[PDB]
Design a protein around this ligand. Structure first.
Ligand code: CLA
Ligand code: CLA
Ligand code: CLA
Ligand code: CLA
Ligand code: CLA
Ligand code: CLA
Ligand code: CLA
Ligand code: CLA
Ligand SMILES: CC1=C(/C=C/C(C)=C\C=C\C(C)=C\C=C\C=C(C)\C=C\C=C(C)\C=C\C2=C(C)CCCC2(C)C)C(C)(C)CCC1
Ligand SMILES: CC1=C(C/C=C(\C)CCC[C@H](C)CCC[C@H](C)CCCC(C)C)C(=O)c2ccccc2C1=O
Ligand SMILES: CC1=C(C/C=C(\C)CCC[C@H](C)CCC[C@H](C)CCCC(C)C)C(=O)c2ccccc2C1=O
Ligand code: SF4
Ligand SMILES: C[As](C)(=O)[O-]
Ligand SMILES: [Ca+2]
Lengths: 734, 163, 80, 64, 211, 142
């Protein structure tokens, strides 16, 4: 009734409280429950939002490139990438003392600096870069593209440029353009980049923009592509002793498929990735021609899903009516996209610590763990968001009339069975994992390590033996010689793979001890429990047995009242709350496992892991209590050093964690009375009753309370673990 | 030889661990006279420790580079060898005992659904009925399979759901 | 404010009114068995949303459900 | 004369009811005429602790 | 500070029990109730029982701080062995320039004095480390209750009961989740149990190896 | 005949407290209650302590509406006494609320017509389809 900030809430405007401020800062991106937000006026806003967020990403990358070019020692890294370490940015903080300027001066060419853990030097030099000007250029380019997207987001807002509604429902042509253009064409351009610049830079050649107009990337240039015999491009690869900054034993091959590692740089051959991305681009181009268009016949979607119907009725209607269901719902596509993005983020994190694509990258021992944990938590949050939007689908966009007989209704019908079996697998994993850990702890406490249980992971070791591993001796595929899998592909990628697999020093199919069994089962427990929480919050969304009409109160509501014996945290948003707690736990267990595995591996004492990864006292002593001495000694009366800021941030993380507990344990009602008391006191202070607050102070909403509590929880968890992973690694180097 | 592991007798680390344990025991065993009680206690402890280390190394159990025993849990690797007792038969023993327990509990909770106020029977049990059913479940695999073919365990979809 | 509804599932027990702390709902004609009353929400400017009327309603499923809406001075129980 | 015989047990089909698909005896089918004539009585409690409820005659069905 | 905050919690629970500014009809609701309703933005932990709930946590905090102060003072500036020339304490007087910083409590007291509790498996003090880890476990276990509700748990019990009724093995007594008040009670119980047990194991395994 | 508010009414004997009577009561609203109270007696205040009450109709006033419904219900509890309510806005306009029927909303009065209700079984509501408007919280019939 009373108009004020914001512009998109008439009910929250009459609200005489600071609550409307928080709900405006929160619901500013919820562009579906606002007043008068019909469909066709929403796609253009979300599209401008895509432009804005892309501009943010490009401006981020531009700032990174700029601080690398001007404040980073990229010149000091290319020449001798082993004797030097990266630098991120400088410091103009007046709060530092004289010892502080002397402690943050690892470089020596400037004042206080900070190490660069982004891993950008390796990825920028593998693609070919040996000058800071080449970095300034890219930074300016990214700033320009950010501005371009900021403008393009606005251009489609005024008429004569506003799109229509039928332009979005045409999923066929858009998916064609994305599979072919967004993936295939860009991949082929990337192959061109690798073959015209990255390779010449690997030969120490200073080949860039000013000279590629006549440089033949291959003798008999482009003629084999005209006159057949493609094999002519894979006849002289990089020599085993190839230098990457110079041309010490170089080659003229561009499309190589030897499938190995570049010994000096310790990464995949710079020429393998060219043929890699070329095959990827060809295959994505083949994929991008599947659909019906204006004049391209292909085959449309409505006739495919309605044809996938098992005749025996195992599914019923099969997939009839799902085209109109998915195409008319954005939360379902968002759930699918976030699920795929999270799973492929985990996949990329798995593939980056095992198949290094970047030259001079595996030698660095700090950016690896940082980037891996980065992508792990990113994938965890993206998966939790995928499940959250999957529940929002059932809550907000669902029409069971159209869905009378599809697989989604069937899935909703036996939801109790799914939830019960998730609960059962979780119970099994938890019971047995905790039981074996407690057993090993009690057995070690009695001083008889022989009496512990150590299940030998025969399955993963068997799969490794099939990969080419011989440490286990199972006489399997790619390990024996009486099989077609070992014979075929002998001049192919097999030699490099088999040579890199039996190496007991690189991270590629590590020697698996029984201590990996227990931790993989703990990870399975964490995954099954998080998935239980999410699937339960999602399936019991339209209506549960306690709250049948749950579809009426939306998605994020505090509770349904203290009636019926107690109803707390019953909304699906609260299940998402708890599932984010479990996501933090699961990703933390995964990161502890990976970190301590590679930590026992880097000290040359993998037997330490193979012997102490069997019980919990080892995890507490050999990992947590042990590898933290530089965190405690970052600053002391003796004098601080470069590791002081990281220790103070390690404490900041714990402070944020405890504030999260503050907002989690104590709930709202308690604080309303205290706020009313403080208001009483503030209105009666003598001569302090001048110009008043503009909005009434009240206690944070219960939903808001738990949201901010989980936000503090997550952010403190992340900062603490990251400060640890960075300090306890980039301070000792061992 | 499986998984790069070696039989646990040829493990130098295993024997080194046994010697370490025995030295650690004897260093504080030498604190007491051969007649007192603590001395006899440590003697018996050393007895069954030596028995631990001797009795394990029979029929074959693999110890790894750490010298500690490692259980093989795959059926097929426990076969074609002698490891069927590591975890293959314990699985069936637990399955038998867990069946037994669930069978007895289910038949109890079913036979109580017929009388008035069954809730009482869940806080004040029928001790003689529980004892009778406790001594009748050690044929449950026979009763379970044929009670499944019977159909007296499938409820014909007459329960409370929400969907 | 708080959108309150009353469905036909009702017996007229007169309990959700002698339990409401803000005297929000009334009970006027209904054709029942022994008491013959039905609840109704004529006014909502003072309803805070405490869901005390939903606890005493013995109807299965409940006859009244408070659709949580927007807050105000009355809806936030603010003496200031 | 309208609803099932009194003392005869019957099940429930109210989609939103705690008691669903399980049987319960009828207290007294309201013969005076009303939209929810059948008053069914259940021994086990609900989330609220109530034992009885009245339902429509188009919802209840026969015995198991 | 901690004692005043605890007294604040307890007294604000005692006074606002017969009446208050928000809900005048507060005496009829009793002493042991979780809330009144999600009205007026939300009412949670308003009863004096909940104020005692929070006062238990604050008493834990205060008593823990005081006992750590006692232990570390006694071990730094009091206790030790006397040689021919003066007394050589347990710690090298680490109390002076470590208590002035929060990191000091983790620099020379918590990190340093925790070697025995995690290094006692080789001796008769391994039970102290076992209680140590178990108390950590039960503490986080209490966190479980403290951060969750009943709706999720009640619906999970619903699906589990579905799984039961398919084989006709469910109980005659209606299996309901714990009450909100009992949920908070279990939370605080496990929380104080884990905390006090961990601190007990620490102070009792550290002090045996230094006396 | 619903009685309207009358100023200059005496008050019960009481010392004071620290509940209510804030800036809200001056510029937004304040609520009033009046009731018989024969046989001068002792009562309890919802935002204070114990007080005495003369015989004959006496009037009180508080900040929140529940602060007076509590007293009305109390009066139900012990001895049959029949108070009333009043509203006040900024313009001084007064509105009578409880009991409008005069028979305590828990009991029907001869005849009226209520709103905010629909004759539909519990549940069986509309799915989110065709509910894109969403009109805040839908009455489902308007
Ligand atoms: C030899 C004859 C044969 C066989 C064996 C099959 C078999 C199959 N057909 Mg087919 N079909 C046949 C003849 C046959 N067809 C003929 C002659 C025609 C006409 C030409 C068709 C036309 C046809 C069509 C159009 C389609 C099929 C489809 C299918 C598949 C789905 C059927 C189904 O009910 O899924 C099983 C239903 C289930 C509910 C299985 C449940 C799976 C559980 C829940 C997974 C558990 C998850 C858990 C976490 C994982 C743990 C794993 C654990 C078990 C270890 C299936 C594998 C459909 C298909 O491709 O899939 C969509 C379909 O589109 N058929
Ligand atoms: C260390 C703290 C802790 C612990 C131990 C657990 C444990 C558990 N959680 Mg949980 N959780 C926690 C913290 C914790 N949580 C926190 C802080 C949150 C956010 C507030 C959550 C949120 C959460 C959700 C949303 C869910 C769980 C679930 C579960 C259960 C999964 C069952 C399982 O996987 O197998 C077994 C796990 C065990 C822990 C069993 C070990 C306990 C042993 C047997 C104790 C035995 C004691 C001994 C026999 C006698 C002692 C009794 C008496 C004498 C004192 C499990 C019991 C899920 C669930 O309920 O499963 C269906 C569920 O969905 N949790
Ligand atoms: C991409 C995001 C990003 C972020 C997070 C930062 C962050 C920072 N920049 Mg930077 N900057 C960026 C982009 C970014 N910049 C880009 C794209 C350019 C090119 C125009 C610059 C050019 C730039 C210069 C020239 C300087 C900084 C400086 C700084 C630091 C202090 C800023 C200050 O106090 O001066 C004023 C803040 C105005 C908002 C700070 C940590 C200053 C510094 O101290 O270097 C570390 C400084 O000298 N920036
Ligand atoms: C407000 C202060 C501030 C600002 C604006 C930045 C900004 C930036 N930092 Mg940085 N950082 C800071 C404080 C800050 N940092 C402090 C106090 C430390 C501990 C000494 C670090 C340690 C640090 C490292 C190790 C790295 C960065 C990096 C970066 C850049 C990548 C984006 C990022 O990581 O976000 C900010 C990060 C935390 C807030 C970015 C421009 C990365 C880089 O190299 O840039 C390319 C990198 O690897 N920072
Ligand atoms: C070869 C043609 C082509 C190409 C290269 C792209 C490329 C792209 N489109 Mg696009 N699109 C196309 C044709 C194409 N489109 C056509 C013909 C239509 C009409 C149906 C659309 C409609 C469309 C929409 C509605 C949106 C995009 C979006 C996007 C961007 C996805 C976000 C991202 O970072 O990419 C991928 C990152 C890593 C692989 C991306 C750069 C999204 C966007 O970001 O907005 C700009 C988006 O919202 N496109
Ligand atoms: C978008 C990707 C891309 C682009 C824009 C180019 C562009 C170009 N290429 Mg090239 N090429 C590519 C991918 C690409 N290539 C890939 C993936 C391979 C590996 C098979 C090759 C292998 C190749 C050879 C062998 C030669 C070229 C040559 C050329 C130049 C002239 C020949 C011509 O294209 O007509 C031209 C500027 C010719 C040249 O003179 O180089 C400058 C030439 O000799 N290309
Ligand atoms: C260079 C070889 C080549 C050839 C022969 C074709 C041929 C064809 N394309 Mg295609 N296309 C190509 C490359 C090619 N394309 C590349 C490199 C891209 C990525 C930019 C595309 C992206 C593309 C799209 C988005 C579409 C086509 C479509 C079509 C068909 C429409 C013409 C028609 O109706 O038939 C007479 C046609 C058969 C249309 C189609 O059939 O849908 C798949 C369609 O809409 N193409
Ligand atoms: C998910 C359960 C599981 C898994 C992962 C494995 C896995 C494995 N089994 Mg096994 N097995 C299982 C269940 C399982 N088994 C069960 C239940 C039985 C009882 C019937 C067996 C009986 C069995 C035997 C007798 C053998 C294996 C063998 C093997 C290994 C080689 C596979 C093979 O048999 O040759 C190829 C598979 C072609 C389909 C392999 C690692 C073999 C082995 O010991 O490796 C040398 C072997 O001879 N298994
Ligand atoms: C909530 C929800 C949602 C979401 C969902 C999700 C999240 C999903 C997912 C998922 C996932 C995440 C998945 C994954 C997976 C996996 C797979 C599917 C696999 C496989 C297989 C294969 C076939 C393979 C093979 C191979 C090869 C090829 C070679 C080598 C070896 C291997 C084995 C690897 C939605 C919205 C939708 C709806 C609503 C609800
Ligand atoms: C202390 C506390 C309060 C009261 C806390 C208050 C009133 C502080 C919040 C407002 C002040 C002004 C915060 C000051 C600024 C913040 C530190 C950050 C604000 C930054 C934003 C602008 C992004 C609650 O309302 C509450 C509600 C539910 C559960 C637990 C609690 C709880 O623990
Ligand atoms: C799990 C959980 C529950 C569920 C709690 C349960 C189910 C406790 C039940 C466990 C007991 C120990 C079951 C044991 C009873 C056995 C069936 C019989 C005893 C065994 C004999 C041998 C004695 C809550 O009620 C709750 C409430 C508020 C916040 C969080 C939570 C919460 O997290
Ligand atoms: S409490 Fe419920 S059943 Fe009773 S009269 Fe009110 S609406 Fe009807
Ligand atoms: C495929 As072959 C080398 O076994 O004939
Ligand atoms: Ca290897």
């Amino acid at each position: 009734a009373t108009k004020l900030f914001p512009k998109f809430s008439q009910g929250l405007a009459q609200d005489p409280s600071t609550r409307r401020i928080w709900y405006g800062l929160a619901t500013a991106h919820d562009f579906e429950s606002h007043d008068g937000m019909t469909e066709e006026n929403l796609y253009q806003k979300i599209f401008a939002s895509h432009f804005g967020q892309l501009a943010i990403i490009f401006l981020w990358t531009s700032g990174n490139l700029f601080h690398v070019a001007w404040q980073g020692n990229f010149e000091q890294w290319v020449t001798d990438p082993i004797h030097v370490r990266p630098i991120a940015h400088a410091i103009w903080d007046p709060h530092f003392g004289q010892p502080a300027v002397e402690a943050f001066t690892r470089g020596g060419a400037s004042g206080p600096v900070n190490i660069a853990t982004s891993g950008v030097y390796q990825w920028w030099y593998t693609i070919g870069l040996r000058s800071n000007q080449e970095l300034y250029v890219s930074s300016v380019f990214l700033a320009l593209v950010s501005a371009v997207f900021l403008f393009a987001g606005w251009l489609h807002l005024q008429p004569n440029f506003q799109p229509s509604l039928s332009w979005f429902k045409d999923a066929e042509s858009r998916l064609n353009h994305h599979l072919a253009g967004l993936f295939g064409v860009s991949s082929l351009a990337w192959t061109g980049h690798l073959v015209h610049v990255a390779i010449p830079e690997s030969r120490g050649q200073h080949v860039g923009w000013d000279n590629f107009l006549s440089v033949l990337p291959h003798p008999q240039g482009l003629t084999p592509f005209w006159s057949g015999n493609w094999a002519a491009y894979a006849q002289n690869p990089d020599t085993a002793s190839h230098a990457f900054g110079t041309a010490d034993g170089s080659g003229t091959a561009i499309l190589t498929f030897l499938g190995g590692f570049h010994p000096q740089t310790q990464s995949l051959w710079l020429s393998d990735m060219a043929h890699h991305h070329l095959a990827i681009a060809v295959l994505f181009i083949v994929a991008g021609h599947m659909y019906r268009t204006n004049f391209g016949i292909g085959h449309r979607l409505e006739a495919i899903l309605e044809a996938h119907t098992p005749p025996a009725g195992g599914l019923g209607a099969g997939h009839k009516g799902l085209f109109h269901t998915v195409n008319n719902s954005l939360h379902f596509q968002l759930g699918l996209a976030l699920a795929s993005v999270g799973t492929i983020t985990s996949l990329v994190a798995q593939h980056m610590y095992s198949l290094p694509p970047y030259a001079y990258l595996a030698v660095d021992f700090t950016t690896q763990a940082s980037l891996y944990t980065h992508h792990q938590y990113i994938a965890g949050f993206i998966m939790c968001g995928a499940f959250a939007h999957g529940a929002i689908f059932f809550i907000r966009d669902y029409d069971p009339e159209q869905n009378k007989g599809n697989v989604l209704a069937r899935v909703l019908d036996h939801k109790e069975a799914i939830i019960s079996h998730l609960s059962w697998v979780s119970l099994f994993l938890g019971f047995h994992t905790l039981g074996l850990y407690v057993h090993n702890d009690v057995v070690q406490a009695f001083g008889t390590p022989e009496k512990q249980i150590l299940i030998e992971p025969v399955f993963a070791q068997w799969i490794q033996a099939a990969q080419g591993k011989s440490l286990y001796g199972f006489d399997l595929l790619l390990a024996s010689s009486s099989s077609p899998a070992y014979s075929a592909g002998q001049s192919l990628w097999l030699p490099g793979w088999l040579e890199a697999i039996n190496n007991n020093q690189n991270s590629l199919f590590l020697t698996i001890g029984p201590g990996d069994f227990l931790v993989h089962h703990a990870i399975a427990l964490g995954l099954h429990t998080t998935t239980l929480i999410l699937v339960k919050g999602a399936l019991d969304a339209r209506g549960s047995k306690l709250m049948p009409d749950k579809k009426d109160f939306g998605y994020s509501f505090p509770c349904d009242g203290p009636g019926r014996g107690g109803t707390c945290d019953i909304s699906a948003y609260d299940a998402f709350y708890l599932a984010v707690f479990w996501m933090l736990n699961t990703i933390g267990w995964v990161t502890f496992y990976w970190h301590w595995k590679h930590l026992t591996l880097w000290q040359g004492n993998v037997s330490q892991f193979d012997e102490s990864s069997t019980y919990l006292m080892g995890w507490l002593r050999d990992y947590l209590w042990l590898n933290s001495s530089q965190l405690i000694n970052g600053y002391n009366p003796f004098g601080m050093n470069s590791l002081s800021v990281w220790a103070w941030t390690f404490l900041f993380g714990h402070l944020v964690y405890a504030t999260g507990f503050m907002f989690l344990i104590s709930w709202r009602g308690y604080w309303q009375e205290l706020i009313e008391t403080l208001v009483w006191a503030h209105e009666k202070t003598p001569l302090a009753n001048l110009v008043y607050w503009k909005d009434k102070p009240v206690a944070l909403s219960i939903v808001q309370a738990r949201l901010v509590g989980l936000a503090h929880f997550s952010v403190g968890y992340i900062f603490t673990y990251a400060a640890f992973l960075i300090a306890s690694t980039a301070g000792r180097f061992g | 030889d499986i998984a790069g592991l070696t039989p646990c007798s040829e493990s130098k680390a295993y024997n080194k661990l046994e010697r370490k344990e025995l030295k650690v025991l004897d260093k504080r065993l030498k604190q007491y006279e051969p007649g007192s009680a603590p001395y006899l206690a440590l003697q018996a402890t050393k007895e069954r420790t030596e028995n631990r280390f001797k009795t394990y190394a029979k029929q074959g159990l693999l110890c790894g580079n750490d010298g500690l025993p490692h259980l093989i849990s795959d059926p097929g690797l426990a076969l074609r060898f002698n490891h069927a007792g590591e975890v293959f038969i314990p699985t069936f023993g637990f399955l038998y005992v867990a069946g037994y327990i669930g069978h007895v509990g289910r038949q109890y909770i079913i036979l109580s659904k017929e009388d008035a106020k069954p809730t009482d029977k869940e806080i004040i049990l029928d001790v003689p009925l529980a004892l009778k059913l406790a001594f009748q479940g050690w044929a449950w695999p026979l009763a379970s399979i044929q009670e499944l073919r019977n159909g007296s365990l499938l409820e014909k979809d007459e329960n409370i759901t929400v969907s | 404010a708080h959108v309150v509804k009353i469905y036909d599932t009702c017996i007229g027990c007169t309990q959700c009114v002698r339990a409401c702390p803000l005297d929000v709902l009334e009970m006027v004609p209904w054709d029942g068995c022994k008491a013959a009353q039905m609840a109704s929400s004529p006014r909502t400017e003072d309803c805070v949303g405490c869901k005390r009327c939903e606890t005493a309603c013995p109807t299965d499923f409940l006859s009244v459900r408070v659709y949580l809406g927007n807050e105000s001075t009355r809806s936030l129980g603010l003496a200031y | 004369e309208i609803g099932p015989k009194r003392g005869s047990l019957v099940k429930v089909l109210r989609p939103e009811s705690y008691w669903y698909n399980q049987v319960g005896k009828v207290v007294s089918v309201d013969q005076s005429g009303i939209r929810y004539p059948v008053v069914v009585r259940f021994e086990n409690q609900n989330y609220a602790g109530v034992s009885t409820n009245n339902y429509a005659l188009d919802e209840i069905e026969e015995v198991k | 500070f901690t004692i005043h905050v605890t007294v604040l919690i307890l007294l604000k629970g005692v006074l606002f029990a017969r009446s208050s500014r928000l809900i005048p009809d507060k005496a009829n609701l009793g002493f042991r109730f979780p809330c009144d309703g999600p009205g007026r933005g939300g009412t949670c932990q308003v009863s004096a029982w909940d104020h005692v709930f929070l006062g238990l946590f604050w008493m834990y905090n205060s008593l823990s701080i005081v006992i750590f102060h006692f232990s570390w003072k006694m071990q730094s500036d009091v206790w030790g062995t006397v040689t021919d020339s003066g007394v050589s304490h347990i710690t090298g007087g680490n109390f002076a320039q470590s208590a002035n910083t929060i990191n000091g409590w983790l620099r020379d007291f918590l990190w340093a004095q925790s070697s025995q509790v995690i290094q006692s498996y080789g001796s008769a003090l391994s039970a102290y480390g076992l209680m140590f880890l178990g108390a950590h476990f039960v503490w986080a276990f209490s966190l479980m209750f403290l951060f969750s509700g009943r709706g999720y748990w009640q619906e999970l019990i619903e699906s589990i009961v579905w799984a039961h009724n398919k084989l006709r093995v469910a109980p005659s007594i209606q299996p309901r989740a714990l009450s909100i008040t009992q949920g908070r009670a279990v939370g605080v119980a496990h929380y104080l149990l884990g905390g006090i047990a961990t601190t007990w194991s620490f102070f009792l395994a550290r002090i045996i190896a230094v006396g | 005949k619903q009685p309207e508010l009358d100023p200059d009414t005496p008050s019960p004997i009481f010392g004071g407290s620290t509940g209510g009577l804030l800036r809200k009561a001056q510029v937004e609203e304040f609520y009033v209650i009046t009731w018989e109270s024969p046989k001068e007696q002792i009562f309890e205040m919802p935002t204070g302590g114990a007080a005495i009450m003369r015989k004959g109709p006496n009037l009180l006033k508080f900040a929140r509406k529940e602060q007076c419904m509590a007293l009305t219900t109390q009066l139900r509890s012990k001895f049959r006494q029949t108070p009333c309510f009043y509203r006040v806005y900024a313009d001084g306009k007064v509105q009578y609320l409880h009991p409008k029927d005069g028979v305590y909303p828990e009991k029907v009065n001869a005849g009226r017509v209520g709103v905010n209700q629909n004759m539909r079984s519990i549940g069986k509501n509309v799915d989110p389809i065709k509910v894109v408007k969403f009109t805040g919280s839908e009455p489902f019939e308007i």
